[PDB]
Symmetry: D2
Subunit: 201 residues, 4 copies
C-alpha cells in the first residue's frame, strides 16, 4: 500500500531562532508554505496513481514539471530546517573535513561565506543557495536554485541550504534580503552540515 | 592540487549500438557535445579558481547557472552511455527489485515504458527523461529535465537516463524523435540500472 | 548621448488603493523593488556601453539573461501601476470592444475573471498573470509569466497585468495569495486596459 | 466563429537559401518543426475552447506554459523566414535608420554582428538570438531566448531573429553551430528588418 509526504516537525520550537528569524516568520514559513509543498506533491501522486489504476492517459510533461517543483520544495525545506538551530548552540564556523574543504576550494571561510551570500542575495526571484560536492573532481560546489528545481545539477547531494524565497524573510526584513542572509550565519547548524558531508566522503 | 573533468571512454565501440544508434550518431554525440560540457565545466572551474587566488569578485549568479548547465551535461551523458549497450546483450525488460518497483509504482512495465516514453517525446526542446527514486515515499519517480538542469529535484539520484536533445538523434532520425525513443528500448542496459537501483535500496 | 531608465511616478497617491492594497504595501513595492529593476537594468546598460567603448569582450549570455530579467521587471511594474486605480473609480467590469472580446474568447467575464485568477494564483513562485492578444487568430490570450521574463510569447503586447511576486502582497496578505488576487478586481482600471486594447485593434 | 494557426508559406523556394541553408535543411525545419508548433498551438486552443463551452476546469498553469511555448515557436519561425532571403539579394549590411541605431548603440556594425553572433552561439540548448528596441530608452536590445519563450522581455517587438535550435542546422552543419551562424549573415534580409524597425519608430 501507498505512501505519502508529511510535514516534518521542526527540530526546535518556533521561537528557537530569534532574534534572527522571528517566531511569526518561522511559524508561517513552516506551516503554510512547507505544508503547501507536501499537499502539492501528494495531490499529484494521487493523480498519477489514479491514472495508473484506471490505465488512462495523463499529461506527464505538466505532471512531472509540477512534481519536481513540489518535491523540490519539500526536500529543500526539509534540509533547511535541519541546518539551522538556536544561535547560542550554532553559528560560528565549521570544523573537521568540511572546514578543510572550504579552505582548499574557497581559500578561506570568509571567501566561502561571501560567495554563498552572493549566491543567495543575487537570486532572481524565488530560490535558494545550496552547498554540494563533486565526488568526481573532489570539490565543493555552490548552486543557485531558482524556484525549487531550476539550475540544479542532477544527482548532487545537499550539504547546506538557504531559503531566499521572499516568504522566508519578508515578515522580518521586508525587502532587505541582505540583512536576512547576514542574520542566517548566526543560526547555521554546522554540526549537521558536517555530518551530511561525511556521509558522502 | 586541483582536479578536473575528463571525457569518459564509452563502455563499448562506437558501432556497438547499431542499427539503433549509428556509429556516426554516437561518435559525434560523444566526441563533440559531451566533450563540450567537459570543457565548459573546466573553463568555469578555472575561472572561479582564479578569482579565489586573486581574491577578486566574480558574477557568481552567472557562474553557477552556467556551472549547473555544464556539469549537468557532463553527469547526464555519463549515466546515459552507461545505461546502454549492444542490442544482443541488452534491451528486454528489467528483473529483480527494479522489476518489482516498476510494477507496484506503474502497474506494469508497459505502463512505465509508455510514461517514460512520453516524458522523452514531449520535452519542449533540449532535455532528458530520467528515472529516480524517493526514499521518503518509497516510490520510483520520473523527471523531465529541460536542458541539463531544469525541472530537476535536487538530491535525487539517477537510475535511468534518456538523452532527447536533438543532437542525440537528428543524424539518424532527423525530426522523428519518437522513432529514436522507440529504438532506445532495444539497447537499454537493465543490468546497470538494476545495479544503480540497489545502491540506494 | 545615452539614455536610461527611471522610476516612474505612480498615477495616484500611495494610499489610493486601500483597503485592497495598503499604503505600506504599495510604497515599498514601488520604491524598493521597482526601483531595484531600474537600477539593475541601468547598471547593465552601462556595463555593455563600457565594453563597447573599450571594444572589449563581455559575457553576453549572462548579460542578456540579466537584462531581460530587469527590463522585464521594469516594464511589467510599469503596466501594473497603470491598470490599477482608486476602488471608487475602478473595478467593475470592462465595456466596449474589450468586453466583446472577453465574451467571445472566454464565454463570459466570469470565466475570464476565473481563468485569469487561476493564472495568478497557480504561478510557481514569483511571476505575473498577463492578458494579451493574437492579431493572427484574433484572440485574447492569457500568459503566466514566471519571474519577469519566463514563459512569455515574444512580440505580444500587454493589456492587463497582475503582479503575484510575494513582495506584492506578503505585507497585506502574508501567504494568502488568493485574497490578494480577489482584492485586485476591486482596483482594476478597465479604462486603461480598454485604451491599450484599442491601440492594437 | 473561431480562428486558428496555419503554416505560412515561405517567401521563396526551398533552395532559395543555398549553399548557406540547404534545401533539405530548410524543407524539414519548415514542414516538420514549424508545423509542429502550428499543431501544438491549435490543439491547445481547442482544448481551452472545449473547457469553456462545457464550463469545466482546466489546468491553466500547464495550458498557458505550453501555449506560450508553441505560439512562441510559431511567431519566431514566422519572423525568421521573413528576415532571410536569396544570398544575391540579401546579406550585406543595413542602411537608413537601422544602420544609424546599430552604430550609436553598438559602436559599429561589426560590434553588433559580433555580439549578436555570441548571443546565438552561446545559447544553452535550444533558442534564438533576437534584435529588438526599447522605445523608453531609445536603444536597440538583443535578447537571448531559450526555447521559444524563456528570457524574453514581454511587450518588446521583433526586428531580427536567428533560430539556433539544433534542428535549424544539424543537417548542414552537425555540431558546428558557429559555421551556421556565420553563414546566416549571407542571407539576412535587411530590407525586411529595416521595414520592421520603421513601424515602431
Ligand atoms: Fe520557503
Ligand atoms: Fe547529448
Ligand atoms: Fe513586483
Ligand atoms: Fe526552429
Amino acid at each position: 500500500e501507498k505512501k505519502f509526504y508529511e510535514l516534518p516537525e521542526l527540530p526546535y520550537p518556533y521561537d528557537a531562532l530569534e532574534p534572527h528569524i522571528s517566531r511569526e516568520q518561522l511559524t508561517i514559513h513552516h506551516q503554510k508554505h512547507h505544508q503547501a509543498y507536501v499537499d502539492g506533491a501528494n495531490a499529484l501522486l494521487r493523480k498519477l496513481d489514479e491514472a495508473r489504476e484506471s490505465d488512462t492517459d495523463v499529461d506527464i510533461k505538466a505532471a512531472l514539471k509540477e512534481l519536481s517543483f513540489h518535491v523540490g520544495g519539500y526536500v529543500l525545506h526539509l534540509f533547511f530546517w535541519g541546518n539551522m538551530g538556536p544561535a547560542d548552540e550554532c553559528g560560528g564556523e565549521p570544523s573537521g573535513k568540511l572546514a578543510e574543504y572550504i579552505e582548499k576550494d574557497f581559500g578561506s571561510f570568509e571567501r566561502f561565506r561571501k560567495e554563498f551570500s552572493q549566491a543567495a542575495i543575487s537570486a532572481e526571484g524565488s530560490g535558494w543557495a545550496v552547498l554540494t560536492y563533486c565526488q568526481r573532481t573532489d570539490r565543493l560546489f555552490i548552486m543557485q536554485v531558482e524556484k525549487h528545481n531550476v539550475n540544479v545539477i542532477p544527482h548532487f547531494r545537499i550539504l547546506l541550504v538557504l531559503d531566499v524565497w521572499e516568504h522566508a524573510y519578508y515578515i522580518d526584513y521586508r525587502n532587505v534580503r541582505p540583512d536576512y542572509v547576514e542574520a542566517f550565519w548566526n543560526i547555521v547548524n554546522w554540526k549537521e552540515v558536517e555530518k551530511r558531508f561525511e556521509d558522502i566522503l
